[PDB]
Design an enzyme around this catalytic site. Structure first.
Site, PDB file in Angstrom:
ATOM      1  N   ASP A  60       0.860  -1.186   0.000  1.00 17.65           N
ATOM      2  CA  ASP A  60       0.000   0.000   0.000  1.00 17.65           C
ATOM      3  C   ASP A  60       0.896   1.236   0.000  1.00 17.65           C
ATOM      4  O   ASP A  60       1.259   1.740   1.066  1.00 17.65           O
ATOM      5  CB  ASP A  60      -0.944  -0.010   1.202  1.00 17.65           C
ATOM      6  CG  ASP A  60      -1.618   1.339   1.438  1.00 17.65           C
ATOM      7  OD1 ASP A  60      -1.800   2.097   0.465  1.00 17.65           O
ATOM      8  OD2 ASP A  60      -1.951   1.652   2.603  1.00 17.65           O
TER       9      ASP A  60
ATOM     10  N   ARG B  64      -0.306   7.776   3.679  1.00 17.59           N
ATOM     11  CA  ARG B  64      -0.742   7.154   4.921  1.00 17.59           C
ATOM     12  C   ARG B  64       0.199   6.057   5.385  1.00 17.59           C
ATOM     13  O   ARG B  64      -0.013   5.513   6.473  1.00 17.59           O
ATOM     14  CB  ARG B  64      -2.154   6.591   4.733  1.00 17.59           C
ATOM     15  CG  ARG B  64      -2.330   5.843   3.410  1.00 17.59           C
ATOM     16  CD  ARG B  64      -3.736   5.295   3.190  1.00 17.59           C
ATOM     17  NE  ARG B  64      -4.062   4.133   4.007  1.00 17.59           N
ATOM     18  CZ  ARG B  64      -5.297   3.705   4.227  1.00 17.59           C
ATOM     19  NH1 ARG B  64      -6.348   4.327   3.716  1.00 17.59           N
ATOM     20  NH2 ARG B  64      -5.483   2.622   4.976  1.00 17.59           N
ATOM     21  N   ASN B  65       1.230   5.732   4.602  1.00 16.70           N
ATOM     22  CA  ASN B  65       2.215   4.732   4.993  1.00 16.70           C
ATOM     23  C   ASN B  65       3.636   5.240   4.784  1.00 16.70           C
ATOM     24  O   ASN B  65       4.557   4.448   4.556  1.00 16.70           O
ATOM     25  CB  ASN B  65       2.017   3.423   4.228  1.00 16.70           C
ATOM     26  CG  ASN B  65       0.771   2.666   4.667  1.00 16.70           C
ATOM     27  OD1 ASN B  65       0.376   2.713   5.832  1.00 16.70           O
ATOM     28  ND2 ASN B  65       0.151   1.952   3.728  1.00 16.70           N
TER      29      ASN B  65
ATOM     30  N   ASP C  82       6.432  -0.253   4.241  1.00 20.47           N
ATOM     31  CA  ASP C  82       5.533  -1.212   3.487  1.00 20.47           C
ATOM     32  C   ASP C  82       6.300  -1.875   2.310  1.00 20.47           C
ATOM     33  O   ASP C  82       5.707  -2.620   1.522  1.00 20.47           O
ATOM     34  CB  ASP C  82       4.246  -0.615   2.879  1.00 20.47           C
ATOM     35  CG  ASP C  82       4.491   0.369   1.709  1.00 20.47           C
ATOM     36  OD1 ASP C  82       5.613   0.474   1.182  1.00 20.47           O
ATOM     37  OD2 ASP C  82       3.584   1.196   1.444  1.00 20.47           O
TER      38      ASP C  82
HETATM   39  C1  LIG Z   1      -2.815   0.131   7.087  1.00 25.43           C
HETATM   40  C2  LIG Z   1      -2.866   1.380   7.723  1.00 25.43           C
HETATM   41  C3  LIG Z   1      -4.283   1.665   8.427  1.00 25.43           C
HETATM   42  C4  LIG Z   1      -1.599   1.785   8.655  1.00 25.43           C
HETATM   43  O1  LIG Z   1      -1.992   2.375   9.635  1.00 25.43           O
HETATM   44  N1  LIG Z   1      -0.294   1.468   8.376  1.00 25.43           N
HETATM   45  C5  LIG Z   1       0.835   1.840   9.232  1.00 25.43           C
HETATM   46  C6  LIG Z   1       1.038   1.265  10.522  1.00 25.43           C
HETATM   47  C7  LIG Z   1       2.136   1.652  11.315  1.00 25.43           C
HETATM   48  C8  LIG Z   1       3.060   2.615  10.869  1.00 25.43           C
HETATM   49  C9  LIG Z   1       4.219   3.048  11.658  1.00 25.43           C
HETATM   50  C10 LIG Z   1       5.500   2.487  11.709  1.00 25.43           C
HETATM   51  C11 LIG Z   1       5.944   1.247  11.031  1.00 25.43           C
HETATM   52  C12 LIG Z   1       6.684   0.270  11.722  1.00 25.43           C
HETATM   53  C13 LIG Z   1       7.112  -0.918  11.115  1.00 25.43           C
HETATM   54  C14 LIG Z   1       6.808  -1.202   9.777  1.00 25.43           C
HETATM   55  O2  LIG Z   1       7.216  -2.383   9.141  1.00 25.43           O
HETATM   56  C15 LIG Z   1       7.837  -2.355   7.902  1.00 25.43           C
HETATM   57  N2  LIG Z   1       8.410  -1.166   7.530  1.00 25.43           N
HETATM   58  C16 LIG Z   1       9.002  -1.162   6.309  1.00 25.43           C
HETATM   59  C17 LIG Z   1       9.040  -2.279   5.458  1.00 25.43           C
HETATM   60  C18 LIG Z   1       8.437  -3.479   5.918  1.00 25.43           C
HETATM   61  C19 LIG Z   1       8.429  -4.736   5.036  1.00 25.43           C
HETATM   62  N3  LIG Z   1       7.812  -3.526   7.148  1.00 25.43           N
HETATM   63  C20 LIG Z   1       6.043  -0.217   9.087  1.00 25.43           C
HETATM   64  F1  LIG Z   1       5.705  -0.406   7.812  1.00 25.43           F
HETATM   65  C21 LIG Z   1       5.615   0.983   9.695  1.00 25.43           C
HETATM   66  C22 LIG Z   1       6.303   3.313  12.604  1.00 25.43           C
HETATM   67  C23 LIG Z   1       7.661   3.356  13.134  1.00 25.43           C
HETATM   68  N4  LIG Z   1       8.647   2.434  12.842  1.00 25.43           N
HETATM   69  N5  LIG Z   1       8.016   4.386  13.992  1.00 25.43           N
HETATM   70  C24 LIG Z   1       7.072   5.336  14.307  1.00 25.43           C
HETATM   71  N6  LIG Z   1       5.793   5.416  13.884  1.00 25.43           N
HETATM   72  C25 LIG Z   1       5.435   4.380  13.037  1.00 25.43           C
HETATM   73  N7  LIG Z   1       4.191   4.213  12.446  1.00 25.43           N
HETATM   74  C26 LIG Z   1       3.020   5.041  12.598  1.00 25.43           C
HETATM   75  C27 LIG Z   1       2.841   3.175   9.603  1.00 25.43           C
HETATM   76  C28 LIG Z   1       1.759   2.803   8.811  1.00 25.43           C
END
Ligand SMILES: *C[C@@H](C)C(=O)Nc1ccc(-c2c(-c3ccc(Oc4nccc(C)n4)c(F)c3)c3c(N)ncnc3n2C)cc1
Length: 277
Positions: A156, A160-161, A174
């Site tokens: 996605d 928002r990501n 993501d």
């Molecule tokens: C689907 C949607 C409603 C949504 O809310 N997505 C979403 C959730 C959480 C965060 C987020 C992260 C974060 C942490 C870890 C990962 O795993 C990842 N990252 C990159 C690549 C791969 C394969 N996995 C995330 F994708 C996002 C995060 C972090 N690390 N620190 C602070 N705040 C954070 N948030 C809000 C993002 C989007």
């Protein structure tokens, strides 16, 4: 069960002390998995004795054997991917002797959609400018170039990501119930992801950035979205936007994938604009 009771977890040098870790608040609803803000210590390897805020991806309450196997495969993916400025990079792990935690960088500033909606000129209001916007888009494009380099696909791809640290630096997330508006016609209709579909998704993201957190294709129901797209209905120009950038967006939205701008071409063009700040 969850901890390795009949599982084979190897021992890496990435693993971080299960002790110094200490979990905290969970950030957002986890489309990629349940992630939690942790306050790790001594993972930078240069700044011990002081806490550092990170994010850890634990398993869900109804986790199944496949969920854990997918988590470890994703961990190995992250380990292989390498290091880039504008990406959520792995920082540590918790593999042997306990439940699996995957340490990834932490972003002080929330999602891009919320961050831009809150950085809107006259939701808080820290003054925002087009110069900062162009820098954001170029950083994101460079990150996406690197992400495509490892031939990874983005589930996605949207504001928002995408995340922002206290340093105001863009980072993708993501790269390893559906966002129909962010999907190309080829991917929306054949349900096959390709770099050209990633270019379309990136262009949709650029529109979301240029409007400071707007919903793409507003007032258009999903059922006829594809049909409207097939007839050559592309989104309009954002209000506080330049025609050249919009033309790049439309090119990213080219119906044919072959002619669509390559990720490197977009990085080159964005660098070109940035030189004229
Ligand atoms: C689907 C949607 C409603 C949504 O809310 N997505 C979403 C959730 C959480 C965060 C987020 C992260 C974060 C942490 C870890 C990962 O795993 C990842 N990252 C990159 C690549 C791969 C394969 N996995 C995330 F994708 C996002 C995060 C972090 N690390 N620190 C602070 N705040 C954070 N948030 C809000 C993002 C989007």
């Amino acid at each position: 069960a969850g901890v390795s009771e009949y599982e084979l977890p190897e021992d890496p040098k990435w693993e971080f002390p299960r002790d110094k870790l200490t979990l905290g608040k969970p950030l957002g609803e986890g489309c990629f998995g349940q992630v939690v803000m942790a306050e790790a210590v001594g993972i930078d390897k240069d700044k011990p004795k002081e806490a550092v805020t990170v994010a850890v991806k634990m398993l869900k309450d109804d986790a199944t054997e496949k969920d854990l196997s997918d988590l470890v495969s994703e961990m190995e993916m992250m380990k292989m991917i390498g290091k880039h400025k504008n990406i959520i990079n792995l920082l540590g792990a918790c593999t042997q002797d306990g439940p699996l935690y995957v340490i990834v960088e932490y972003a002080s500033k929330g999602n891009l959609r919320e961050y831009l909606r809150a950085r809107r000129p006259p939701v808080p209001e820290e003054q925002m400018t087009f110069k900062d916007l162009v820098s954001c888009t170029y950083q994101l494009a460079r990150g996406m170039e690197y992400l495509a380099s490892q031939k990874c696909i983005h589930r996605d791809l949207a504001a928002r990501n995408v995340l922002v640290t206290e340093n105001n630096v863009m980072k993708i997330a993501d790269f390893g119930r559906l966002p129909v508006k962010w999907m190309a016609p080829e991917a929306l209709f054949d349900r096959v992801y390709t770099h050209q579909s990633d270019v379309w998704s990136f262009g949709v993201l650029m529109w979301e950035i240029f409007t400071l957190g707007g919903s793409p294709y507003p007032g258009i129901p999903v059922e006829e979205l594809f049909k409207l797209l097939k007839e050559g209905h592309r989104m309009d120009k954002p209000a506080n936007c330049t025609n050249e950038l919009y033309m790049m967006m439309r090119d990213c939205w080219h119906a044919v994938p072959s002619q669509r701008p390559t990720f490197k071409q977009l990085v080159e063009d964005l660098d070109r604009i940035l030189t004229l700040t």
